[PDB]
């Protein structure tokens, strides 16, 4: 039985997760063991750099967070939570945390490196994805959310900017900066404006159904090349989202439109993923009729795109200014990050 196999798989995954969640791993490397290659991304907290593990020659994406900046930006809980989730999860489409450590100034998370880069870059380059291309990525997200939701984790920041592509053309969910492990409802205003479910905008209690709404936004943006609700400023985007109105490009198939009407559903008692049959309402939808869910999970499906090569191995990535990694002689924010 396929259904009893799903139940047994998830029961084992929860047992594995809870063991790691209760006793997280800490201090599994040191900065002196890595060579910096290039900055891949910069933000408020700090940055992500491509690095080489000197002992093996393996490459990784190292997230560097300045402890003082994290404290100033009120991100202590978010930082500790992101690391705690990353070390406890295990799914083929979730980025692996290889090592983590801290020094006087910084927190370090050494992650699996995804050389295919952002889905965002490819989507804006190509304009839009064909429906089979969009469907392949959408199927990965469905399975990822079925896994995360089973562990009572709400993701809350789905967007092309967050979805990396690996060597096999498969996507990888990477950023857990807003994910929360909660059973009932939650109230925080977080996420990205275009991707917010109306109940988030309206300050109502919300649950895992917000991720199914964000999936609708993602599918739409992938298939259209632009999101369903956009405007000059976030407040104007919120107005469109809460309106209860959506328009589709003429090239969208009838099946795609029907799936999107069920995901981009204001009414929580009607939203797909949130009904009695849960995720099976999405998995069994006509738009996914050609999807072999087990073959996607087993990574047996040939990806629609497998990532012009210029000088070096980072030639297709944007150029960030290479800034120093300063390690103060004084320990900063020791008590705040003792669990890291």
């Amino acid at each position: 039985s396929e259904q009893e196999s799903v139940k047994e798989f998830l029961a084992k995954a929860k047992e594995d997760f809870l063991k790691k969640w209760e006793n997280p791993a800490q201090n599994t490397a040191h900065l002196d063991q890595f060579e910096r290659i290039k900055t891949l991304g910069t933000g408020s907290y700090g940055r992500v750099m491509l690095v080489k593990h000197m002992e093996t020659g393996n490459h990784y994406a190292m997230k560097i967070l300045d402890k003082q900046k994290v404290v100033k930006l009120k991100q202590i809980e978010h930082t500790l939570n992101e690391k705690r989730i990353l070390q406890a999860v295990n799914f083929p489409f979730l980025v692996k945390l290889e090592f983590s450590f801290k020094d006087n100034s910084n927190l370090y998370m050494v992650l699996e490196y995804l050389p295919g880069g952002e889905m965002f870059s490819h989507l804006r380059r190509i304009g839009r994805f064909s429906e089979p291309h969009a469907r392949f990525y959408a199927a990965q997200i469905v399975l990822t959310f079925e896994y995360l939701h089973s562990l009572d984790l709400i993701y809350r920041d789905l967007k092309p900017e967050n979805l990396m592509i690996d060597q096999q053309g498969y996507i990888k969910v990477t950023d857990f900066g807003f994910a929360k492990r909660v059973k009932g409802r939650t109230w925080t205003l977080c996420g990205t404006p275009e991707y917010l479910a109306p109940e988030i905008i309206l300050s109502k209690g919300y649950n895992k159904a917000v991720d199914w709404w964000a999936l609708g936004v993602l599918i739409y943006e992938m298939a259209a090349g632009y999101p369903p609700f956009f405007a000059d400023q976030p407040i104007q985007i919120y107005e469109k989202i809460v309106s209860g109105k959506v328009r589709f490009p003429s090239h969208f198939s009838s099946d795609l439109k029907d799936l999107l009407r069920n995901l981009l559903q204001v009414d929580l008692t009607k939203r797909f993923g949130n009904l009695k049959n849960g995720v099976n309402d999405i998995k069994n939808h006509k738009w996914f009729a050609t999807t072999d869910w087990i073959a996607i999970y087993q990574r047996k499906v040939e990806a629609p795109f497998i990532p012009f090569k210029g000088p070096g191995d980072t030639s297709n990535f944007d150029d960030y200014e290479e800034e120093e990694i300063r390690v103060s002689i004084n320990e900063k924010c020791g008590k705040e990050f003792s669990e890291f």
């Binding site: 965002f120 900017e161 977080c190 990205t192 632009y226 405007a231 000059d232 985007i237």
Partner: peptide
């Protein structure tokens, strides 16, 4: 067109979380 409106929005670049 909707595509022209998307370009005019000025939110075609990478979007930050709130």
């Amino acid at each position: 067109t909707t595509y022209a409106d998307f370009i005019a929005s000025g939110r075609t670049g990478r979007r930050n979380a709130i």
